[PDB]
Amino acid sequence: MTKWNYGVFFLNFYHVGQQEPSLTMSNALETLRIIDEDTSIYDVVAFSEHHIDKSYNDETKLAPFVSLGKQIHVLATSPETVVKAAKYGMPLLFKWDDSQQKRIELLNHYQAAAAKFNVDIANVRHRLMLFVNVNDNPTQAKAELSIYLEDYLSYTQAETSIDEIINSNAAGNFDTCLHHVAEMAQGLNNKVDFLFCFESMKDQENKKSLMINFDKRVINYRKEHNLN
Amino acid sequence: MTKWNYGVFFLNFYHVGQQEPSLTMSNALETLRIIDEDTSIYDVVAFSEHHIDKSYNDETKLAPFVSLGKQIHVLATSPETVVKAAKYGMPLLFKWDDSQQKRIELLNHYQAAAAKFNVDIANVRHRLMLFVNVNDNPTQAKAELSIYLEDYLSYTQAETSIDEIINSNAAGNFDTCLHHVAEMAQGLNNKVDFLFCFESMKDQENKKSLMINFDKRVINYRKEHNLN
Numbered sequence: 281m282t283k284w285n286y287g288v289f290f291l292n293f294y295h296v297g298q299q300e301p302s303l304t305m306s307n308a309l310e311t312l313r314i315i316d317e318d319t320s321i322y323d324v325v326a327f328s329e330h331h332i333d334k335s336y337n338d339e340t341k342l343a344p345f346v347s348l349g350k351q352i353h354v355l356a357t358s359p360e361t362v363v364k365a366a367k368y369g370m371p372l373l374f375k376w377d378d379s380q381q382k383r384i385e386l387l388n389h390y391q392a393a394a395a396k397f398n399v400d401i402a403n404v405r406h407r408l409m410l411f412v413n414v415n416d417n418p419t420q421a422k423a424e425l426s427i428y429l430e431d432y433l434s435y436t437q438a439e440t441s442i443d444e445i446i447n448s449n450a451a452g453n454f455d456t457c458l459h460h461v462a463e464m465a466q467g468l469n470n471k472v473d474f475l476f477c478f479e480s481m482k483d484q485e486n487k488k489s490l491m492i493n494f495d496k497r498v499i500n501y502r503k504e505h506n507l508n
Numbered sequence: 509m510t511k512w513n514y515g516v517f518f519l520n521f522y523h524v525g526q527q528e529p530s531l532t533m534s535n536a537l538e539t540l541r542i543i544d545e546d547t548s549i550y551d552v553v554a555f556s557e558h559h560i561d562k563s564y565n566d567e568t569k570l571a572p573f574v575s576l577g578k579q580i581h582v583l584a585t586s587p588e589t590v591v592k593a594a595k596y597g598m599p600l601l602f603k604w605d606d607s608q609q610k611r612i613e614l615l616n617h618y619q620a621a622a623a624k625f626n627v628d629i630a631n632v633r634h635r636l637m638l639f640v641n642v643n644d645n646p647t648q649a650k651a652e653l654s655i656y657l658e659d660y661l662s663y664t665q666a667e668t669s670i671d672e673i674i675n676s677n678a679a680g681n682f683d684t685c686l687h688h689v690a691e692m693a694q695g696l697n698n699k700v701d702f703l704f705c706f707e708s709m710k711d712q713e714n715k716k717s718l719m720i721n722f723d724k725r726v727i728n729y730r731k732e733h734n735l736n
């Protein structure tokens with residue numbers, strides 16, 4: 281057992297769930313407010329911005345480094361990129377928009393690389409980005425996540441299937457999400473810390489209540505298991 | 509008096525001071541190593557990546573948000589962007605590649621905006637990115653910084669003058685840099701925390717020694733002034 285770390289991410293995209301930009305902005309500021317004043321477990325913030333091509337004039341690409349606090353992660357963008365991270369034993373950052381199956385393929389490819397280069401990654405913990413929508417009515421959590429993501433999936437011309445996206449993220453009641461996320465972590469050898477995106481939750485009070493309930497549960501768990 | 513915060517940044521660019529990429533990479537990992545094991549003041553890490561255009565298909569641009577730890581900053585890319593940050597009282601991130609004169613214009617434009625919107629920014633602290641090259645021989649610090657930046661300035665087709673860039677950053681002996689940086693902060697109303705880029709220092713031991721000496725000096729200062 282080890283202490284699992286949590287954080288938050290924001291999707292840097294202007295059109296989500298037919299919301300006007302200033303509404304999306306306002307919702308995001310509330311999330312920030314909750315992290316700063318209402319809770320203590322949300323350690324770092326990151327942005328999802330891989331929908332934009334970041335290339336130089338000669339077609340070489342910006343290196344996909346992401347800092348989380350003082351820790352540098354490499355966005356797991358392709359099997360080749362994960363091998364470059366393995367060369368230095370650097371932690372990965374898994375995309376929320378990759379299916380769980382793809383994430384697992386990528387982590388194992390990384391593990392194969394390290395073994396091949398003889399790099400000790402025993403202590404490396406990666407980060408997994410997940411969209412989280414918790415609703416007492418499971419159907420409503422899913423509908424909300426779906427509506428939120430429609431323009432982005434359309435923009436990115438995703439092959440995916442919103443179904444898969446949903447299955448690879450966390451939409452449902454609290455208990456279902458807890459378990460589903462633990463399952464996904466297991467799928468990734470329990471080597472992943474997390475970044476959650478709560479922006480699909482339309483109700484700000486529900487978002488607040490969820491973030492605070494989870495904060496308290498994690499603090500208790502850490503204490504109970506001598507994880508702090 | 510207030511506690512000034514420090515961090516580090518890396519320039520996400522492959523060609524610096526005629527170094528092969530793996531050498532630049534290796535130097536950067538040493539910086540990370542020093543921050544994690546040898547010191548405690550370097551709080552956050554960021555990347556300089558504004559040399560790449562980040563636009564959508566319709567010519568709209570990615571919003572220039574940067575997270576530092578759990579704090580969201582807006583890159584001060586233009587007077588209009590700074591007004592958008594002022595609307596919400598968000599902190600700015602000043603570019604190392606803007607002359608000091610331009611930074612001062614931008615901060616005051618931000619302050620004018622906030623006053624106009626009646627937004628209280630009393631408590632806001634911004635972050636300033638600076639390249640730091642400390643050498644007992646002042647001439648050598650400058651030459652090193654100049655050689656390091658030549659390809660980047662050329663790529664960005666900077667209007668600037670490496671001279672100005674140098675004057676707006678910190679190259680020289682330790683005491684000169686301490687004072688020069690304090691001066692720049694004063695120019696920005698003492699409302700700036702910092703991000704330093706040490707990558708132009710060719711000698712890894714000198715880089716290490718500098719980072720550790722500064723760490724100790726800051727800890728003492730904080731204690732002496734009841735800043736912690």
Ligand SMILES: CCCCCCCCCCC[C@H](CC(=O)O)c1c(C)c(C)cc2c1nc1c(=O)[nH]c(=O)nc-1n2C[C@H](O)[C@H](O)[C@H](O)COP(=O)(O)O
Binds near residue numbers: 284412499501
């Ligand atoms: C607002 C967010 C809602 C979305 C939900 C996100 C869920 C986050 C992951 C779950 C955290 C649980 C702990 C907690 O309540 O804080 C949790 C759960 C629900 C489950 C089923 C298993 C967990 C777990 N948390 C763990 C943790 O922090 N550290 C661990 O080491 N293990 C955790 N586990 C057990 C895990 O599934 C594995 O069984 C063990 O890691 C295996 O260890 P071993 O026996 O030593 O090999």
Ligand SMILES: CCCCCCCCCCC[C@H](CC(=O)O)c1c(C)c(C)cc2c1nc1c(=O)[nH]c(=O)nc-1n2C[C@H](O)[C@H](O)[C@H](O)COP(=O)(O)O
Binds near residue numbers: 341344358529533536
């Ligand atoms: C602690 C981190 C600080 C970073 C400081 C900036 C240093 C830049 C030099 C990086 C050199 C690496 C090469 C090596 O083996 O050492 C490197 C790395 C680690 C990564 C992740 C990507 C790199 C890369 N070097 C490149 C280079 O010299 N020239 C390139 O043209 N591209 C390089 N890349 C990018 C990589 O080749 C891929 O194009 C991107 O990862 C995008 O991949 P995709 O989308 O998955 O296809």
Ligand SMILES: CCCCCCCCCCC[C@H](CC(=O)O)c1c(C)c(C)cc2c1nc1c(=O)[nH]c(=O)nc-1n2C[C@H](O)[C@H](O)[C@H](O)COP(=O)(O)O
Binds near residue numbers: 698
């Ligand atoms: C490896 C890096 C080398 C590059 C050098 C970076 C320099 C960083 C800025 C300087 C930090 C000094 C403190 C320290 O040693 O840790 C410092 C210096 C050198 C000077 C000349 C003035 C400083 C100062 N640090 C300050 C700080 O942390 N907090 C403050 O509030 N004030 C500092 N000052 C004084 C400042 O110039 C102003 O006089 C006061 O802020 C004015 O306050 P007021 O009277 O209450 O209005």
Ligand SMILES: CCCCCCCCCCC[C@H](CC(=O)O)c1c(C)c(C)cc2c1nc1c(=O)[nH]c(=O)nc-1n2C[C@H](O)[C@H](O)[C@H](O)COP(=O)(O)O
Binds near residue numbers: 294301312585592
């Ligand atoms: C706590 C932060 C979490 C972020 C979550 C993502 C939210 C995205 C919505 C942002 C809406 C803003 C508009 C408003 O007044 O509320 C906003 C902001 C704050 C900023 C900094 C830039 C924005 C922007 N909204 C835009 C929009 O709706 N449509 C656009 O096409 N562009 C927007 N921009 C970008 C801005 O207009 C500039 O193009 C960029 O700042 C680049 O500027 P330049 O390089 O300085 O020219």
